[PDB]
């Protein structure tokens, strides 16, 4: 019965939650003021995306000091206040930990790149050019172009799976391993309740520097060099789990800690279970099954869930429909016509999946993707790979609190725009509206919490037939039948039970368009 098993986690993007000093950017005092929103929602924890000292090339995921707060967001004083307010509200607090790379402006890299003999020479991945000047391997950056960059300081290439500004850490190096573990300890000694571990399968590359093989044609249009090749050797080294053991060993030194890993790629499930196996690795992990899905299908849900059987040493999966890395799901999965009814099907479904619900800021209000022009881009990835981008900027818009000029974000000049379609969806307006998605999400969260078959139950059946999904889950004497219509065709279901919840005119025997019902 660990607190995290069955939790809902509300992910905060601190640049766009609440700007408490009027510069156009969210900040930690902003988050402190707004925390009651999350509490009243009934989320068990917050996960704060990176707020550490950073040049902000990957907007905080390029860390230059692992143990301080960036001036953009306030101070270490302000982080201790978010922890204390959260705990007073009964919220657990998770922070992002970014261990596959640092900024190029990090003190470790400034030492590493200085020459070939320094104590940190080997904390990053250095290799000579080919005799013709070429890079040491054919590896390609996640964000466009190659995964290696020249440094004349050393007369060598250095590896970066992401921007040239995010040189890959060499976690094969036990001194680097020890250093990032000591960073995690710093954060654990400040009362943090655990971690979201960034791109954990990028922690470790192949020391042999073998070329990646060509990718088969899964004819998703190829957007960038990275899409041409299987990520065989640039990442996913067999030794990552041994490193994760030292993490769990470290978190076991403190009370009631939760770890969840982000795990990228289509090679996904094998490293997720390896990263979460038994009680020696991480608690949980999430992948991109929903983040990169064009459509929400029953077959995609029964595919995803089938990967995580209740076997005795298997991990506990986490689910993310949307976050800062993928367009707002309502802009992917449904027409404007269908949006209102779909938003509640989707929210109820997230709460009915076996695993943890990763709710992203704005998801409880039904915020839509804001289209960001090429002139107005921030994400380097998009400028490089236009028009075939990851569309992350439009996912990162300021949280709308009221219907004021600044929508209560704290700035008539925010760093990204609110979006005309998100302005009417503000938390204030939704607190006045009795059928609001804010009020529905509360209800979905309360129904998961109070029902042990939703909260944690086994998936005893997952049945898919065209647009109909049925989840049969079960725990503590309870057996629930969860029926979902992911389609605009009224579908006819043989129940013989009690309706816990019915939406969009769902009945025990019939499901109109985008209707769902939980039967006990």
Numbering used by the authors: 5 to 497, 499 to 525
Could you share sentences copied from the article?
Here we detected a novel GH13 family α-glucosidase, QsGH13, from the deep-sea bacterium Qipengyuania seohaensis sp. SW-135. The α-glucosidases (EC:3.2.1.20) are members of GHs and are widely distributed in all organisms that are specific mainly for the exohydrolysis of α-1,4-glycosidic linkages at the non-reducing end of polysaccharides, such as maltooligosaccharides, and release α-D-glucose. The GH13 family belongs to the GHs members and is mainly composed of (β/α)8-barrel fold catalytic domain A, a loop-rich domain B, and a conserved domain C. The enzymes of the GH13 family catalyze reactions mainly through a double-displacement mechanism, in which catalytic nucleophilic (Asp) and acid/base catalyst (Glu) play an essential role. QsGH13 is highly substrate specific and only hydrolyzes sugars containing alpha-1,4 glucoside bonds.
The crystal structures of QsGH13 molecules were fully built to 2.2-Å resolution with the satisfied Rwork and Rfree values of 21.83 and 27.38%, respectively. According to the diffraction dataset, the QsGH13 crystal belongs to the monoclinic space group P212121, with unit-cell parameters a = 58.815 Å, b = 129.920 Å, c = 161.304 Å, α = γ = β = 90°, which contains two monomers per asymmetric unit. QsGH13 has typical and conserved characteristics of the GH13 family, where the catalytic domain A (residues 1–107, 176–463) is composed of a typical TIM barrel, sandwiched between the loop-rich domain B and the conserved domain C, and it is mainly composed of (β/α) eight-barrel structures, including eight α-helical and eight β-fold. The loop-rich domain B (residues 108–175) is derived from the domain A, including an α-helix and three β-fold, which are involved in the formation of QsGH13 dimers and forms catalytic pockets with domain A. Domain C (residues 464–525) is composed of multiple highly conserved β-folds that stabilizes the entire protein structure. The QsGH13 monomers formed dimers mainly through five hydrogen bonds and 105 non-bonded contacts. After the superposition of two monomers, the root-mean-square deviation (r.m.s.d.) value was 0.250 Å using the DALI server. QsGH13 forms a deep and narrow catalytic pocket of 14 residues in (β/α) eight-barrel structures (TIM) away from the dimeric interface. Although it is not clear how many amino acids are involved in the catalytic process of QsGH13, we found that eight residues in the catalytic pocket, including Tyr65, His105, Arg200, Glu266, Asp202, Phe292, His328, and Asp329, are conserved in the family of GH13. The β → α loop 4 of QsGH13 is located above the catalytic pocket, and it is associated with substrate specificity. The β → α loop 4 of QsGH13 is demonstrated to be more dynamic than other regions of QsGH13 and the β → α loop 4 of HaG and XgtA by IUPred2A analysis.
